[PDB]
Amino acid sequence: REAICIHIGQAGCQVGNACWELFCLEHGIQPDGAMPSDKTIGVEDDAFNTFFSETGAGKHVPRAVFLDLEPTVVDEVRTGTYRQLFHPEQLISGKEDAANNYARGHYTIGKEIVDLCLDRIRKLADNCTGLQGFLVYHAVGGGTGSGLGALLLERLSVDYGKKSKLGYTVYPSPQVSTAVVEPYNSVLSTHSLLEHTDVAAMLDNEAIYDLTRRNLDIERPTYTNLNRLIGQVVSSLTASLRFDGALNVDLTEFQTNLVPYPRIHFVLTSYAPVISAEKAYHEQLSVSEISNAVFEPASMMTKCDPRHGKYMACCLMYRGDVVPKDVNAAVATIKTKRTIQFVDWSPTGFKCGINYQPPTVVPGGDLAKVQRAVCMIANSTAIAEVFARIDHKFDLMYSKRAFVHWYVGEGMEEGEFSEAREDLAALEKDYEEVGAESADMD
Amino acid sequence: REAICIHIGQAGCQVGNACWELFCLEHGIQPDGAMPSDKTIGVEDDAFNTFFSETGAGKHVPRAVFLDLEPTVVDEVRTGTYRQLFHPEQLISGKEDAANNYARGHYTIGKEIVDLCLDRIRKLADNCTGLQGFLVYHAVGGGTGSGLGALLLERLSVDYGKKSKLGYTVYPSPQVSTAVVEPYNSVLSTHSLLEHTDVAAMLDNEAIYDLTRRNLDIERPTYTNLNRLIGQVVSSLTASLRFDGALNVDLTEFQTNLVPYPRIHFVLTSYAPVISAEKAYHEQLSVSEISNAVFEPASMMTKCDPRHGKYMACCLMYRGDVVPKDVNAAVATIKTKRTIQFVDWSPTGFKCGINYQPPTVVPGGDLAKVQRAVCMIANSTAIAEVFARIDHKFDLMYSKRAFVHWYVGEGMEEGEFSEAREDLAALEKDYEEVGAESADMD
Amino acid sequence: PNGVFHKETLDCTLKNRSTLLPRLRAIVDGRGHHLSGSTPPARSFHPQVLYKNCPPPVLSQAGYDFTPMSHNAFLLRTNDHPQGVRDVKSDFMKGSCDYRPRAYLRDEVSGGVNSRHCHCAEVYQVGDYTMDLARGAEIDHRNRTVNFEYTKKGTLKSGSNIVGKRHARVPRF
Amino acid sequence: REIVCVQAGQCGNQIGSKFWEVISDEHGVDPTGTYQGDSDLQLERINVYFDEATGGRYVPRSVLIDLEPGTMDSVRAGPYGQIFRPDNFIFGQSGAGNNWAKGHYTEGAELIDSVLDVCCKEAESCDCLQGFQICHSLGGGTGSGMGTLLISKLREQYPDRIMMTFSIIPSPKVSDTVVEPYNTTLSVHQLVENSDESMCIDNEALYDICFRTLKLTTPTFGDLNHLVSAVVSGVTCCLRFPGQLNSDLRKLAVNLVPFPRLHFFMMGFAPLTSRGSQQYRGLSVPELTQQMFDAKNMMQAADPRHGRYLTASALFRGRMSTKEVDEQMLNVQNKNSSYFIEWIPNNIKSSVCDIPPKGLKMAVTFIGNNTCIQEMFRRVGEQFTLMFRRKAFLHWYTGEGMDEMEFTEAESNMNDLVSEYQQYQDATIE
Amino acid sequence: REIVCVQAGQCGNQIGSKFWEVISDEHGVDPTGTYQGDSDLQLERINVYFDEATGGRYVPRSVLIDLEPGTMDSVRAGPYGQIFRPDNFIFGQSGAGNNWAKGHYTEGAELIDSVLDVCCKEAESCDCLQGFQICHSLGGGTGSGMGTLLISKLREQYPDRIMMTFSIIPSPKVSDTVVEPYNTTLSVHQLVENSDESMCIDNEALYDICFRTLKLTTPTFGDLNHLVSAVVSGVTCCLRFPGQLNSDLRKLAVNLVPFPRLHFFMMGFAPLTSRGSQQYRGLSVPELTQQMFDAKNMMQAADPRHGRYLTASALFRGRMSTKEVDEQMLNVQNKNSSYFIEWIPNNIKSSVCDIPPKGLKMAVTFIGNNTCIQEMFRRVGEQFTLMFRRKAFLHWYTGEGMDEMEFTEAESNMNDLVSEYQQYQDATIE
Ligand SMILES: Nc1nc2c(ncn2[C@@H]2O[C@H](COP(=O)(O)OP(=O)(O)OP(=O)(O)O)[C@@H](O)[C@H]2O)c(=O)[nH]1
Ligand SMILES: Nc1nc2c(ncn2[C@@H]2O[C@H](COP(=O)(O)OP(=O)(O)OP(=O)(O)O)[C@@H](O)[C@H]2O)c(=O)[nH]1
Ligand SMILES: Nc1nc2c(ncn2[C@@H]2O[C@H](COP(=O)(O)OP(=O)(O)O)[C@@H](O)[C@H]2O)c(=O)[nH]1
Ligand SMILES: Nc1nc2c(ncn2[C@@H]2O[C@H](COP(=O)(O)OP(=O)(O)O)[C@@H](O)[C@H]2O)c(=O)[nH]1
Ligand SMILES: [Mg+2]
Ligand SMILES: [Mg+2]
Ligand SMILES: [Zn+2]
Numbered sequence A, B: 001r002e003a004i005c006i007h008i009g010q011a012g013c014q015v016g017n018a019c020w021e022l023f024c025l026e027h028g029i030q031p032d033g034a035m036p037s038d039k040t041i042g043v044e045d046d047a048f049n050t051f052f053s054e055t056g057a058g059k060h061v062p063r064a065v066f067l068d069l070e071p072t073v074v075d076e077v078r079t080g081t082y083r084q085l086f087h088p089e090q091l092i093s094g095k096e097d098a099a100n101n102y103a104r105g106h107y108t109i110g111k112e113i114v115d116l117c118l119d120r121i122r123k124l125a126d127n128c129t130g131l132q133g134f135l136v137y138h139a140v141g142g143g144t145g146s147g148l149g150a151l152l153l154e155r156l157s158v159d160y161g162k163k164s165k166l167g168y169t170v171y172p173s174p175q176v177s178t179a180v181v182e183p184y185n186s187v188l189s190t191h192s193l194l195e196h197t198d199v200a201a202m203l204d205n206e207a208i209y210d211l212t213r214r215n216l217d218i219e220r221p222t223y224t225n226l227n228r229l230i231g232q233v234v235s236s237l238t239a240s241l242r243f244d245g246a247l248n249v250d251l252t253e254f255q256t257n258l259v260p261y262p263r264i265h266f267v268l269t270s271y272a273p274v275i276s277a278e279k280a281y282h283e284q285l286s287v288s289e290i291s292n293a294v295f296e297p298a299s300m301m302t303k304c305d306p307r308h309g310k311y312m313a314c315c316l317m318y319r320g321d322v323v324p325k326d327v328n329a330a331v332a333t334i335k336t337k338r339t340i341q342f343v344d345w346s347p348t349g350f351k352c353g354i355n356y357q358p359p360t361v362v363p364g365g366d367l368a369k370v371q372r373a374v375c376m377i378a379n380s381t382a383i384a385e386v387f388a389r390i391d392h393k394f395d396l397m398y399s400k401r402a403f404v405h406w407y408v409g410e411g412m413e414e415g416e417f418s419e420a421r422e423d424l425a426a427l428e429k430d431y432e433e434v435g436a437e438s439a440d441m442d
Numbered sequence C: 001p002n003g004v005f006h007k008e009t010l011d012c013t014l015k016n017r018s019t020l021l022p023r024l025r026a027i028v029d030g031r032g033h034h035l036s037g038s039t040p041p042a043r044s045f046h047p048q049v050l051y052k053n054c055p056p057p058v059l060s061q062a063g064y065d066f067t068p069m070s071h072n073a074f075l076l077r078t079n080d081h082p083q084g085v086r087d088v089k090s091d092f093m094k095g096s097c098d099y100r101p102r103a104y105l106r107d108e109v110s111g112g113v114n115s116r117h118c119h120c121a122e123v124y125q126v127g128d129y130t131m132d133l134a135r136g137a138e139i140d141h142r143n144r145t146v147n148f149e150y151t152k153k154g155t156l157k158s159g160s161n162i163v164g165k166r167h168a169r170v171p172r173f
Numbered sequence D, E: 001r002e003i004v005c006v007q008a009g010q011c012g013n014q015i016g017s018k019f020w021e022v023i024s025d026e027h028g029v030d031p032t033g034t035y036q037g038d039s040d041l042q043l044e045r046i047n048v049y050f051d052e053a054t055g056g057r058y059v060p061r062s063v064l065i066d067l068e069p070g071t072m073d074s075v076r077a078g079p080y081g082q083i084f085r086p087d088n089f090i091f092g093q094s095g096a097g098n099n100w101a102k103g104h105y106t107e108g109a110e111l112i113d114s115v116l117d118v119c120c121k122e123a124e125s126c127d128c129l130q131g132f133q134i135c136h137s138l139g140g141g142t143g144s145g146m147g148t149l150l151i152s153k154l155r156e157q158y159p160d161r162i163m164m165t166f167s168i169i170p171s172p173k174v175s176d177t178v179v180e181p182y183n184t185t186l187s188v189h190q191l192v193e194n195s196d197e198s199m200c201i202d203n204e205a206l207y208d209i210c211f212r213t214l215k216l217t218t219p220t221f222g223d224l225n226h227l228v229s230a231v232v233s234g235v236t237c238c239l240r241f242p243g244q245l246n247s248d249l250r251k252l253a254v255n256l257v258p259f260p261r262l263h264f265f266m267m268g269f270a271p272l273t274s275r276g277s278q279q280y281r282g283l284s285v286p287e288l289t290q291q292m293f294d295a296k297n298m299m300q301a302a303d304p305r306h307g308r309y310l311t312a313s314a315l316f317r318g319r320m321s322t323k324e325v326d327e328q329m330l331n332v333q334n335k336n337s338s339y340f341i342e343w344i345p346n347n348i349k350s351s352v353c354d355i356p357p358k359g360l361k362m363a364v365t366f367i368g369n370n371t372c373i374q375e376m377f378r379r380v381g382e383q384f385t386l387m388f389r390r391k392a393f394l395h396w397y398t399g400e401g402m403d404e405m406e407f408t409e410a411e412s413n414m415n416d417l418v419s420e421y422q423q424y425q426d427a428t429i430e
Helices: A009-027 A072-079 A102-125 A143-159 A182-195 A205-214 A223-242 A251-258 A287-294 A324-336 A383-398 A404-409 A415-434 B009-027 B046-050 B072-079 B102-125 B143-160 B182-195 B205-214 B223-242 B251-258 B287-294 B324-336 B381-398 B404-409 B415-434 C003-008 C010-023 D009-026 D070-076 D100-123 D142-157 D180-194 D203-213 D221-235 D249-256 D285-293 D322-335 D373-389 D394-400 D404-425 E009-026 E070-076 E100-123 E142-157 E180-194 E203-214 E221-235 E249-256 E285-293 E322-335 E373-389 E394-400 E404-425
Strands: A002-008 A052-054 A060-062 A064-068 A091-093 A131-139 A165-170 A199-203 A245-247 A266-271 A311-320 A350-355 A372-380 B002-008 B052-054 B060-062 B064-068 B091-093 B131-139 B165-170 B199-203 B245-247 B266-271 B311-320 B350-355 B372-380 C129-132 C162-165 D002-008 D050-052 D058-060 D062-066 D089-091 D129-137 D163-169 D197-202 D264-269 D309-317 D348-353 D363-370 E002-008 E050-052 E058-060 E062-066 E089-091 E129-137 E163-168 E197-201 E264-269 E309-317 E348-353 E363-370
Touching (some): A064 A072, A064 A143, A102 A182, A287 A311, A324 E203, B009 B223, B091 B102, B143 B165, B199 B205, B223 B266, B223 B350, B251 B311, B266 B381, C010 E373, D062 D070, D100 D394, D180 D373, D180 D404, D203 D221, D221 D309, D249 D309, D285 D309, D285 D363, E009 E070, E070 E089, E100 E180, E142 E180, E180 E404, E221 E264, E221 E363, E249 E363, E309 E322
Parallel strands (some): B311 B350, D002 D062, D002 D129, E002 E062
Antiparallel strands (some): B245 B350, D264 D363, E050 E058
16 A cells, blocks of 8 residues: 655656656645545545545645755755645755765765654654555766665665565666766666665666657657656556556566566666657557557667567556457567567566556646556666676776776775676676576576 | 558659549548548448548548658648648658669668658558558659669568568650669669569550540640549559459459569559540440450550560459440450460460449549549560660660769669679560460470 | 376376476576586677577667667567467457468579578678578478477477678788 | 358359348248248248247358458348358458469468368258258369368268259350469369269350340349359259159269269259240240250350260259150150260159249259260360460469479379260260 | 355455355345345245345355455445455455465465454354355465465365365466466465365456457456356356256266366356347257357367367256257267267266246356366476576575475476376277
């Protein structure tokens, strides 16, 4: 029943703003924290409970924390439209940023703020009766997202136990870039995140910009569009807990079906009916068409091509007016294709889910209104190319000690670079060996 | 049941405008695809399905793609009268033309544009359940039509395999000409088309100009008249799939009946009641009269005289008020003629088709209204004369390497000219050998 | 209750037990790593290993602003069904009996390839080798696999399209 | 004594629609399926062609097979189409391509199991099963290939019953299909081993019947299919109505076939005459016998005067005397004695049934076993040899997978059939 | 003679809701629990599935178990949910995660004592106890683990009663869960030792039933669960209504199982027919028998033509003569003799019950014991061997605590079961 959302840093807080806007409009909680006038104790109305808790006066408040080291974005939330929705204690802000240094966030600044975060999460977890996981939003490219996200996941992993941790992560784009030190922060973040996360979903802004240019008709997209797409995907994955359906899927089922070996937990995500209102009137949107859509790499929110690898498992979530025979026919048609390949040790490659609630439409949005949608998260060996491309840039920079004095000055041993680089080399070797056919292995 | 149309370049898109105008008016779909505000379905029957698909709201959209490297012609389609009929993704346009170079279309630019075209055609083929062939319209005289048409037919032949591909091709007229480099492009096109096409119908503008001067009363004809005649021919051949009749003919039957050996797939086309309104009320138009008309060279849409060769197979399609006994009597009378000769190894030379739907009348058209028509496609050795004249003009220019530096600059080896020329020489020898009497060889 | 039952079904049980149990032995470490014996001849992400029986992708900048992505294809697989399963259709499916490749019996009923255009869509240069889609596992007239091969321990072996090795070198005087 | 019908291909489905209209009319079945007849004689043998539905309705025992549903869609839309059971329509998703090898080997093996399942479901329901009846063309693709495939499977599964075929064969003057010789030769090779009795009809003979004999101003395929349905329904008349001299399909075979390979027959129906000329001449047994032997009323292009009759059968419908039948058959045998094989003392079998078709006082259907059928096989073998020596269109069949030895075997078997007919034509006692 | 039902997991609870709707309809129980039936014949055996509550109410003898209450909250909120006794819902606080080891060892042992307490309270209340009936899926987590745990405990506590299970098994074409081979193999290993008779269903077979036979345009899980509820309520119909030839679960087991390991059966239900077709065929015993043996109407992917029937049972509901039932079963055994094991002189048992389900004149449910079920186990064992050689996803199961020897034992035992079926299929008298 309950799930707690943790939002970290700039991308994570802005995506949180889009997500809670969506969850409010889908359940019907007004921006001032009030159920509409037509809802009473006359009928059973509890679906919000997965994301909201009600006070004794009947106000709703959401099960989320927003974490930042700079005040500006949380002060924008405090001064924005949803001022009365959030409890003021939930919006925690420090004085100064981690300045793109993972070392500054982890060692110098996040250690001061971390105890307040664990106390707030504990205060939320005490007001629950069926918590079944944490959802985490952060970027690994920036200093506070990497450092405080790693430190907080480590502390949560020590305090709590046998609880799932699912991450939605914005990785550094392969040629679009925002900072020079992106490789160092991404390597050290992935090194800490490898041991303490059950499934990690990867997003790339360059891919979602391509998707908003290609599918929608937006010439000059901005982060609010990207954040609305991310909000739709998270709403689709968590819809299985909140509404009636033929085949529900608990968050623990994702880790069981998608992860074959404990280190192999990085998955691709895609969403099918990304379409504009003018295109929506030229096309029917049947189950088989959107099922065919989720497998094209042009539909993915991470810049990787799955044709350079092999799939090990796929999880397909259908929501809306769908009938099981059409889901079975669609999955059977995909399996026939020769350019889609699965490793020979994974014969039963699919997990299915079917939910009746269609996706909600947001007043200023750019997506059309549709009766059905499908969302996919999948595990594939193609991910080794993303790490290989980050590692080449790391090797280029570390060969000349390009920026190390900053990291050593803020408190970190230089040895940590070599340890993380060796762990990523071993992860590359795991992805090389796992893709080897069994017939050649004898 | 369904067929997908691919239109390439300038001639193919302009002929496509006339074709879709006719198919809309014959089935009854409005030019914008909508329906009156009170009806629940625009038409009572599914017969349109061969060429159109309807959305669940009842809008119609057609099963076609338009491919061009210059934007102007596709932009004219986007701004014309049928703007709402086509899905905007189907109208594909590049930035710059193939500049009359087969090498530029095939190696440099069509190689870049071809993957979008294949993705659109795949999206159409996924929304089908009994696809039975591709229809292709292009001219082999220009650069993008030749180069991208050949490259796309090669890729289609690998991806779809056994499915039939029928081409309507505009070849360079024997004395009317528009560009200097026509022989090189036509030779290299015919070289690619030999391996990758099941039946190719050849058209020459000089024949349609002669037909419009003698039969119609047009002093100043333009391409729209020729394109309306081509659309009528395509409608006659595909009518067998769409309306009731005594003897139906599926698109797979043409390749089986007309092609004796895998290289001998080039056919002549003619249409009988091409007649003006003033002549139509002075004459009766019985079955035997139009059957006698189809064998006269004044009726043909390709500039070749079949009296200088031998027929291998004929396919006669009758549509309208015709009775089978009259068709049998007419064909026996044609068989009696002495200027019509069949190779002695082909005793059963004819295939017949009979359909009840008479030809449609188009508001701005120039053809009269008639109760019946017949259309013929036939394989004959006379076609060898067209290739001999193209090959002689190629030999004249190639003796001094007159323009080869453009083709070599755009990516092609000089060796490809010589290879294509020996393959067309071998095709000429094939037409000499197939025509040798069996009684003469003992 | 299981005396005569086990006595009568003895020899077949021992035969199947002697066959199956050697296969159940683990060949991979608990970390997902191969044992010291029977190492693979080549690494997995090599061009000829990854694309042994599948065309490699083609990338182009058309339609994209940033790093391009490839596209799916419609190439179907062989019409093979599990042994002893009813002809199941949940709805109207696209059977693989049709879309039979045109390379079937090409060298016998036809003259074979007579142009270099086979390199455009049928012959690929994967790394240091050559892939040909017309020279794979043998199929019958109904697009069904003819031959099935097994290792010493009894694992099904997939087909290969790799025909030859290309000795590439840079030019010099 | 129940018959199971199979309709295959475009020609078979189109002839079948008209046949079931004629049979439903003769037994007074409404197009809704309700019995509305006016005599118990109609109801007492309805089981022979119809299955019984619960309240008033009857359902027809027929299987329709085709590779593209277009023809079936035309017959289902027709005025009597609703009577057919929905589960009896079997179709694929791609056409036969007018090619015998595709119809027999590639799409044939894909669909054949569902057709055999339907045929077994229909056959095992009968309390006593009589022979199967199949309509198809030999020149086509799915008709020839799947008809002969299904015939072979049914002969393996039901070897003790009768196998009957009605088949359309290429005209001598104009072809409807270019590859007719291959499809015809392979189909005749399959039939001569598997079939028990085969009837052949030329479309040219139906055109000449309609234009010359009936003087119809605007004939249509409905008329040709009505002539075929009339003779087909006439052959079975003694199975389903009373009469003075009953007859049966097995009794016809026993009297018509002297040796097992000689089972190909010519067909004719006698009282064809234009509505204008009917007033001048009345109906009588001499008139029916004269029309019955007139080549104008025979459904093949070959003429009996170039061959000899081994055997013949006449089935008469109507109330008439046996004396006139016996004396007519004796007088015709004695007066034209050179055209009857002399080592058989009487070549004609007669049968008499009381109930004529509505609106005619009397009718007869004629079945003839004549050696002039050898001219057709000789012509087909000539055209086959012309095409095969030059490999005229052979790559389609070889590309599907056929061995050329199949073509040489089929040619040899047909050539031996022509030789056997020619030897028995010129045989003598010595 | 009353049965106690157990519903476990999502699939079990959903099928159970439809079963209790069908049973409440047949005995005329309002969803409030009030009797509103229209014949005393309904009341006189109501005890078989219902227990009697004091006032005007009836309570159903069922235990509901699940690890997360989501499904139970959906069914309790349903239109018939109120009938269930509140104390009969047993639930934990975290899901099984579709993992057998978690469902069997950690939360299983935590809840099993409370489930056994409820089952004992219900069993010791009966005046005479008949067998237990359990519905669950084998591919899931709490269904497989807690179902097999409870089955083992009830077999220790009630070894003299009957143990019957209805089980959902993985489709051969598309998986619903990635780790199905492990859960299926361990569950089949537990069932073959513990169970007395087990029925297996493929969702793919129900999809083929819906698309081919009923031609439904938009089927829902309510239709599949209605077909299952129809067969389950049909097998026990003779237990609770009068008839000419009574039958019982123990008598069915004695006639169906030749040897204790050979207890896996196929099921079918006959009067399934599309809304368009009903006008074309009246109900009769031959029609029911023909649908009864048509593989299109069988709820498993394996086809009878690759195996042989050791035994079969048919239970008929309706007013009918024993002669047609006996002679139909003889005719089917005689005509298809190659598919019946020859060393048993008669493989089919028949039973006749007078009262059909409302709205049908007649109905039959079919249970079949056929050796072709060995191919399904062979396919699952193959996929298990493929996954185990590479230790596929093994760390979850090993992390809960299972010894790998359990996996090797379960695989070896199932492989011996396929070998045993293969040996009896090809056995001979000699
Ligand atoms: N999709 C998306 N990406 C964002 C958003 N905001 C920032 N990013 C991306 O994330 C990276 C920057 O990370 P930040 O979140 O700004 O880093 P930070 O967490 O603020 O760390 P500090 O700078 O030390 O405070 C760049 O690649 C940005 O493109 C957002 O709102 N949506
Ligand atoms: N019948 C007919 N012929 C046409 C039409 N348009 C062009 N042609 C002929 O086709 C040839 C020119 O080919 P184009 O279609 O212009 O070549 P293209 O496809 O535009 O190739 P690029 O010039 O490289 O862009 C000439 O012989 C023209 O006479 C048309 O609408 N109808
Ligand atoms: N008498 C008659 N002949 C037909 C009919 N339809 C087709 N034919 C003939 O049958 C031959 C064509 O065979 P067809 O039925 O098309 O073969 P298919 O393609 O396998 O179905 C030609 O000689 C046609 O003239 C029909 O309704 N009546
Ligand atoms: N026929 C049928 N199958 C179902 C139903 N619900 C789930 N299943 C199937 O059962 C399997 C999932 O098992 P599940 O019940 O979720 O296992 P659990 O998690 O242990 O309860 C999949 O194959 C589903 O397709 C249902 O109502 N009817
Ligand atoms: Mg910041
Ligand atoms: Mg141009
Ligand atoms: Zn090429």
